[PDB]
Design a protein around this nucleic acid. Sequence first.
RNA 1: GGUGCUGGAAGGUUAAGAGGAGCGCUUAGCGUAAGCGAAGGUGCGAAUUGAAGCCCCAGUAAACGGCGGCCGUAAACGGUC
Length: 52
Amino acid sequence: KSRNEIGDETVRKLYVEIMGRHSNIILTDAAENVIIDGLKHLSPSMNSYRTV
RNA sequence: GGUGCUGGAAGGUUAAGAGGAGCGCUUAGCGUAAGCGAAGGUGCGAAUUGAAGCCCCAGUAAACGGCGGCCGUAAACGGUC
């Protein structure tokens, strides 16, 4: 439940995946569920499914 | 943003024209000496007023015109001028 930098409040959902070598940390905005940023950036070609 | 066009004087810059302070030049006369000098005439004219325009403020790009660089990351996103 993070306050935005402009003053209002918008809930953020942080996703932690622990899958060994496929582990990643991905933050979403919890309303549209688009990836704001990821700890490991993946391409549409390399790891085509679940592109970060 | 700059330049054109349109709109706006809050504030400065404002010309000619009004306005006349004051300062020189002459001398009727006061003066032992060198100077002071009223009324006129004759030049310089300071303050104060005195519009558009300029500085300024907004809009306008089928107006004039312009639409960038470096480093990463896989067009797109992040850091900086």
